[PDB]
């Protein structure tokens, strides 16, 4: 306690070594206040510390970051951190409320005149004070709203100066010309709106033009890059090399995405005030996606969540023209390694939902592009199977809509393509059976061991590897399978069941696309009236491959009468029945010529899986 | 022309379908292969656009695969002709053909599994030369070249796994020197400027993976390149990409674990890793910490008798500085639980922080499963610290203030009460967290352990009342178990858990406390003793070793009865049994009479008639009827 008192008296009588000692004492008190943050003696410390801080803060701004300047900067940092770190809750024994007007006014003035490295903390302190001390400080929100409106108004001029008209030795600019505070503002503004309710109705009208202008803001270099790329017929992505300050560009995009999140939040109920601004939203979204730097993945994730929140509001009809543009992988994902490795499922799931909702009014080219993209997505080598399951479900859902196209040739082609994709997936699954079995057994044993995992060589664990471990034998682990706790056999069975369930619906949809007059049905059994007809030599191959690859995947379920439930279970039997029923809906000639060719392979296959 | 191309491709594929005929010699001509590649590129380019007539789509789709298979079959003969392989790889990676499993199925089974230490070094050197600047090869090609480089090293590692210090004759001095010159020794003046090309990050990740594998498996071969490796790893930390940065951290941690470094770098890297807050690459940070921290004492020894290591204060420093961010606290605690022994000495500054942050980590209203696991894990960590202290004393040490112990105990009781799982019982109709929590609670309250606190401990009136005496809970307990509507599973689970905890605490209470507090015990248990649900009765009366996990905790009814001197409790229980038997609820009456008889046989004389009537009327009758029906069936 003596050390605190001597430091306090030294500070009071103050108004390199001395300044260093003062910095050490003040920041050590900051660190150790946990013993004195809450207590009945808080009012004395508050009233004795406020005057000295206020008196010191009246000095002129200091821009240099070396020597005594750095010392006083650290002093101010670990002095002002007390205000944020203090228990400023709204509990009855709060003692800061009676002495808040002068300090908050001085802090607002500091925000007006201070610099980035100070204004950021000052605005955060103001926000946290308003969150709790709104009881009697309710009358000064006018100054804060005016200041934030001024910042939003001068955003345009600061951007113009930084882009169009454009460490110790550096000079710190004034905070009014920094993108960091602008990017941080929206969360504070939303928090203030949440706190109070008496100054929300009239101010949103003034805010709306500001947010509109901020979103419409664009950089001349990037604009000309995009224009020339469009003239060339291609699409330009990334960061324009003409930009001299890449960090300023990145901060600008961060501010843009923060503003987009603010717009999404405000659209909940005040959408009537933003009705006129809807048509420009999709183009701005596409531009932001194209111009987002590859490194800043968090900005892209925030943009994705913002688009999800906006689309949930049933405003999808405006996104139709840009659906084709968004399908391109370069625009949606980019060249980012982290994005490509972590966030692809989220982006493709939101796009799949958007496509599913508005499927009714899609043109043939969009249908073709979606089919191609998601058929390619089905064959991906992602560690799990949820991404593949989502792609498969989207394809199966779109199968129904694909049959309404005016041109029957295209619909038949697309359905056959979907069947071919399913057959290729079945072959891929067939290729991975031994590895899945071995990994299942190894995981069982490892879980049985119940010992901590260490990433070092061990003689007790010889490194067995095979064909499927070509690119999975390196020490680095992007995501440990232990967290997933996934069993490959179970995942493969789940995916197989989903595909089998969708196969019948796809075949039924194809059953209603016969080209009238293509074939003669003068005399045919009633059992063979509504089946699909008109198969060329290339589709019989697809059907035969589908059968032969589908039958061989039943090894994952590892005399025959089995009167009681034995060997094969109910699930396997019903899956087999569903698989067999699919081939009841084709031309009898195709059935004959397919099974006359497949019978020997089936006979060979039975010797390994007797349940066939 | 496209029909002719399709027909020619189909005919050529039909040829060579029976390779055991010596008729494949026509595949050795190079002009034919070049013409095939040209026509295939043209056909694929036409396919990429919707230019072909609508009648020629599927045939061309199949012809492309046939062409790729033909090219791979030609590649199979003379595997050592690497120029053809590189040209085919360049074509594949340049968006000229479509990939097929055959290429990889050939790479494997011809190069990776080649039974010769020769033909591996040549391939590695050629792949490095293509990678070693030289341009004329896009980034995707470099990545696909690493795709073949790494498996060879992995296979060599696998093939030389034996006791007699097997050497890697494949990894001769020349190959290591070339790797050093081409990857490590090369100091990029400004690799950031090279970032203006796509897919470079993947190549950087591949080289990092190769270096990490080489270190981890042949640490004994880098004594002449330690310094170059350190410079390489430190330089690559500057990368702005998250995944590359964390991979560099993992590599440097591998080296630190497998080698000796001055304490400055280890301290700097550890401090930087702790400050990490991005939720991306969490597993990489976990692996780096696991690889680094265990060997920290060797890398950072401390003076004898000194219990304030700098690396020990650093986690405390960050905990104090960034206490506002919950993610930082979660990460620091996740790191801390895994290593209790290292921080056993410095627990002085950590125990109170853990106890205080317990509430923050898990929200009583609705926490997440991971938060519950972390809270229970920290609880177990502090319990392990206490057990270590006791064992060391047996084989003025810091002890927690009684206030902290009281807060921890009440929080744990509430957490058990609000747990999701249900305590297993013999009567359950057709659990790890609950078992662990109950075992921890039982262990803590042992006499030599915190068990000295039970004397001043009350029966947690707030929680017990709000969980058991609630009007909704009272009516649900008095409700019919048959009706699902009045069978809220969560509430019944809460009743079972609170009953178990009250049983455990009463097992440690003092007889005088029970005699004094009898009215409160009666008030609490009156609702439950009348319940007709078998699980409640099993909780109240039964106590089996199997379900208690090796704990001799006698039932509550037996304990309270034994507390009575050899009273009001006996009369109250007899009245409950009489009214229950009269009402036809045998489940409660039979159990109550069983407990009473096990206490004092003299009371069942006035109850014999009811037991006999029940037996003659319902139980035996229905049992015999059911077995007769089964015999009839």
């Amino acid at each position: 306690m003596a050390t605190s008192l001597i430091e306090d008296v030294v500070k009071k009588l103050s108004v390199y070594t001395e300044l260093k000692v003062k910095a050490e004492a003040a920041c050590a008190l900051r660190d150790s206040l946990d013993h004195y943050t809450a207590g009945p003696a808080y009012p004395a410390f508050l009233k004795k510390v406020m005057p000295v801080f206020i008196h010191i803060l009246r000095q002129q701004p200091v821009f240099q970051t070396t020597g005594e300047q750095g010392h006083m900067q650290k002093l101010r940092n670990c002095i002002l951190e007390i205000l944020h770190r203090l228990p400023t809750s709204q509990t009855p024994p709060e003692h800061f409320e009676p002495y808040a007007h002068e300090i908050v006014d001085l802090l607002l003035e500091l925000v007006r005149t201070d610099n980035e490295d100070n204004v950021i903390l000052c605005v955060k302190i103001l926000s946290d004070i308003m969150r709790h001390q709104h009881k009697i400080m309710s009358g000064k929100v006018q100054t804060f709203l005016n200041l934030i409106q001024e910042l939003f108004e001068q955003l345009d001029k600061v951007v113009r100066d930084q882009l169009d008209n454009t460490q110790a030795n550096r000079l710190l600019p004034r905070g009014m010309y920094s993108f960091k505070v602008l990017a941080e503002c929206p969360i504070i503004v939303v928090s203030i709106f949440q706190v109070h309710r008496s100054a929300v109705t009239p101010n949103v009208k003034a805010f709306v033009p500001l947010i509109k202008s901020a979103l419409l803001c664009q950089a001349k270099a990037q604009d000309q890059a995009h224009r020339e790329a469009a003239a060339r017929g291609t699409i330009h992505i990334g960061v324009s090399p003409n930009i001299k300050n890449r960090a300023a560009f990145g901060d600008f995009i961060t501010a843009q995405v923060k503003t987009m999140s603010f717009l999404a939040y405000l659209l909940r109920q005040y959408s009537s005030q933003l009705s006129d601004f809807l048509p420009h939203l999709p183009d701005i979204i596409v531009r932001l996606l194209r111009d987002c730097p590859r490194d800043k993945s968090s900005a892209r994730k925030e943009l994705f969540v913002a688009i999800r929140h906006i689309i949930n509001f049933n405003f999808r009809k405006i996104f139709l023209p840009k659906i084709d543009e968004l399908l391109d992988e370069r625009t949606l994902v980019g060249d980012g390694l982290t994005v490509h490795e972590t966030m692809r499922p989220l982006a493709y799931s939101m796009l799949a939902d958007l496509i599913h909702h508005v499927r009714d009014q899609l043109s043939p080219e969009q249908i073709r592009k979606t089919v191609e993209v998601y058929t390619r997505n089905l064959q991906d080598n992602f560690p799990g199977t949820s991404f593949q399951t989502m792609s498969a479900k989207l394809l199966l859902n779109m199968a129904e809509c694909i049959a309404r196209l005016p041109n029957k040739v295209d619909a038949r082609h697309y359905l056959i393509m979907i069947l071919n994709a399913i057959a290729d997936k079945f072959a891929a699954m067939n290729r991975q059976y031994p590895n899945a079995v071995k990994l299942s057994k190894q995981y069982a044993q490892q879980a049985a061991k119940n010992v901590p995992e260490t990433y070092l060589a061990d003689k007790e664990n010889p490194p067995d590897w095979d064909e499927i471990d070509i690119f999975n034998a390196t020490p680095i682990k992007i995501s440990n399978p232990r967290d997933r706790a996934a069993d490959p056999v179970v995942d493969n069975k789940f995916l197989f069941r989903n595909l089998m369930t969708g196969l019948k619906n796809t075949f039924y949809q194809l059953k209603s696309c016969n080209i009238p007059g293509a074939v003669d049905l003068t005399g045919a059994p009633a059992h063979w009236t509504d089946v699909a007809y008109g198969f060329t030599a290339e589709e019989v191959k697809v059907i035969a491959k589908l059968f032969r690859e589908g039958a061989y995947v039943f090894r994952y379920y590892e005399y025959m009468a089995n009167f009681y439930m034995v060997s094969s279970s109910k699930e396997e039997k019903e899956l087999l029945e569903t698989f067999a029923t699919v081939f009841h809906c084709i031309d009898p000639a195709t059935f004959h010529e397919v099974f006359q060719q497949e019978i020997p392979r089936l006979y060979e296959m039975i010797h390994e899986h007797t349940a066939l | 022309k496209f029909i002719a191309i399709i027909n020619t491709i189909n005919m050529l594929d039909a040829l060579c379908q029976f390779p055991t005929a010596n008729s494949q010699s026509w595949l050795d001509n190079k002009e034919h292969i070049e013409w095939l590649k040209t026509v295939g590129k043209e056909l694929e380019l036409q396919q990429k656009k919707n230019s072909l007539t609508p009648n020629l789509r599927l045939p061309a789709h199949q012809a492309s695969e046939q062409l790729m298979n033909i090219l791979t079959k030609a590649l199979d003969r003379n595997p050592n002709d690497l120029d053809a392989l590189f040209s085919l790889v360049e074509g594949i990676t340049s968006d000229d053909f479509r990939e097929t499993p055959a290429l990889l199925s050939h790479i494997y089974n011809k190069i990776i599994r080649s039974d010769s230490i020769d033909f591996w070094r040549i391939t590695i050197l050629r792949c490095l030369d293509i990678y070693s600047g030289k341009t004329a090869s896009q980034r995707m090609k470099w990545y696909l070249l690493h795709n073949i480089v790494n498996p060879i090293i992995a296979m060599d590692v696998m093939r030389t796994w034996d006791d007699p210090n097997k050497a890697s004759r494949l990894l001769d001095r020349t190959v290591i020197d070339s790797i050093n010159t081409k990857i490590w020794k090369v100091n990029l003046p400004d690799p950031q400027e090279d970032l203006l090309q796509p897919r470079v990050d993947h190549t950087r990740m591949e080289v990092l993976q190769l270096s990490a594998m080489l270190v981890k498996y042949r640490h004994a071969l880098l004594q002449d390149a330690r310094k170059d490796f350190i410079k390489f790893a430190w330089t690559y930390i500057r990368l702005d990409d998250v995944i590359n940065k964390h991979a560099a951290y993992v590599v440097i941690g591998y080296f630190i674990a497998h080698y000796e470094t001055p304490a400055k770098i280890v301290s700097q890297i550890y401090f930087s890793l702790l400050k990490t807050n991005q939720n991306e690459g969490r597993a990489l940070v976990t692996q780096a910490l696991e690889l680094m921290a265990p060997v920290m004492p060797k890398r950072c020894p401390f003076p004898p008798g000194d219990r304030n290591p700098v690396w020990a204060l650093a986690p405390r420093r960050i905990l104090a500085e960034e206490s506002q961010n919950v993610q930082q606290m979660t990460a620091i605690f996740h790191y801390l639980v895994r290593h209790p022994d290292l921080f056993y000495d410095t627990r002085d500054k950590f125990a109170m922080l853990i106890i205080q942050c317990l509430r923050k980590v898990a929200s009583p209203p609705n926490p997440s499963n991971d938060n519950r696991k972390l809270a229970l894990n920290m609880m177990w960590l502090i319990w392990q610290w206490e057990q270590r202290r006791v064992e060391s004393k047996l084989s003025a040490e810091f002890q927690i203030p009684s206030v902290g112990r009281h807060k921890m105990i009440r929080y744990l009781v509430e957490f058990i009460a609000q747990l999701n799982e249900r305590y297993p019982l013999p009567s359950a109709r057709p659990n790890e967290l609950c078992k662990k929590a109950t075992a921890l609670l039982y262990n803590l309250l042992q006499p030599q352990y915190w068990g000295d606190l039970v004397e001043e401990m009350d029966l947690f009136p707030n929680v017990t009342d709000l969980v058991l005496a609630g009007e909704k809970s009272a009516t649900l307990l008095s409700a019919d178990p048959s009706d699902p509507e009045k069978c809220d599973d969560k509430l019944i689970t809460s009743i079972i858990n609170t009953l178990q905890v009250v049983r455990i605490v009463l097992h440690f209470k003092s007889d005088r406390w029970i005699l004094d507090n009898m009215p409160q015990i009666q008030k609490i248990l009156e609702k439950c003793l009348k319940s007709a649900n078998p699980e409640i009765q099993d909780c109240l009366h039964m106590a089996d070793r199997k379900y208690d996990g090796d704990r001799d905790v006698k039932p509550t009814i037996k304990r309270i009865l034994d507390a009575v001197p050899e009273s009001e409790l006996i009369a109250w229980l007899s009245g409950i049994a009489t009214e229950s038997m009269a009402a036809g609820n045998y489940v409660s009456g039979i159990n109550i009479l069983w407990s009473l008889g096990h206490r004092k046989p003299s009371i069942i004389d006035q109850h014999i008639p009811a037991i006999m009537r029940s037996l003659q009327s319902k139980l035996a009758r229905d049992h015999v009827s059911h077995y007769a029906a089964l015999g009839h069936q």
Side-chain angles (χ1 to χ4, degrees), chain A residues 367-420:
Chain A
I367 284 271
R368 183 186 78 71
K369 290 192 184 298
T370 71
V371 162
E372 196 264 21
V373 171
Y374 278 87
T375 46
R376 160 142 38 78
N377 271 356
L378 214 175
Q379 313 296 339
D380 204 30
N381 242 321
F382 218 67
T385 58
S386 48
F387 191 42
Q388 283 71 315
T389 309
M390 181 265 307
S391 309
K393 97 168 274 187
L394 172 56
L395 273 169
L396 271 284
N397 276 350
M398 207 59 56
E400 200 274 358
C401 154
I402 282 164
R404 235 74 79 71
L405 271 178
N407 193 5
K408 301 305 212 178
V409 171
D410 312 338
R412 269 181 75 85
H413 183 65
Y414 303 148
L415 297 170
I416 296 288
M417 279 285 107
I418 282 162
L419 290 181
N420 181 45

Side-chain angles (χ1 to χ4, degrees), chain B residues 19-81:
Chain B
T20 73
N22 206 12
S23 81
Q24 290 197 132
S25 320
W26 73 272
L27 287 164
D28 290 24
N29 175 288
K30 312 312 188 300
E31 305 85 340
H32 296 153
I33 301 284
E34 295 293 320
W35 171 83
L36 261 174
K37 288 188 183 176
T38 42
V39 296
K41 298 154 190 251
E42 170 58 10
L43 180 59
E44 186 265 311
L45 177 71
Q46 281 269 305
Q47 284 198 255
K48 180 174 157 194
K49 304 271 194 301
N50 188 353
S51 46
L52 278 192
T53 56
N55 175 41
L56 273 278
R57 298 139 137 183
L58 202 38
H61 175 94
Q62 300 182 350
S64 290
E65 309 182 339
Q66 276 167 339
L67 158 64
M68 271 303 315
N69 186 296
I70 274 164
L71 283 169
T72 63
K73 209 92 80 209
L75 222 70
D76 186 298
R77 297 171 62 83
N78 314 116
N80 304 272
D81 191 332

Side-chain angles (χ1 to χ4, degrees), chain A residues 2 165 192 217 255 259 261 329-330 343 383 428 467 472 486 554 575:
Chain A
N165 311 51
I192 278 153
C217 188
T259 36
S261 61
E329 60 88 4
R330 285 276 203 216
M343 312 164 11
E467 273 199 65
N472 324 309
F554 279 98
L575 253 186

Side-chain angles (χ1 to χ4, degrees), chain B residues 269-316:
Chain B
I269 296 178
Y270 167 99
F271 164 41
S272 305
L273 261 164
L274 281 196
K275 280 205 92 76
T276 326
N277 66 288
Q278 295 97 81
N279 42 354
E280 297 67 22
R282 193 79 276 152
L284 291 163
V285 169
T286 291
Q287 164 163 14
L289 289 161
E290 168 54 68
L291 267 171
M292 203 179 351
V295 291
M296 161 175 298
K298 175 174 179 194
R299 301 286 185 286
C300 275
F302 37 86
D306 194 331
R307 295 180 179 184
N308 310 307
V310 177
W311 47 258
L313 307 156
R316 178 71 205 84

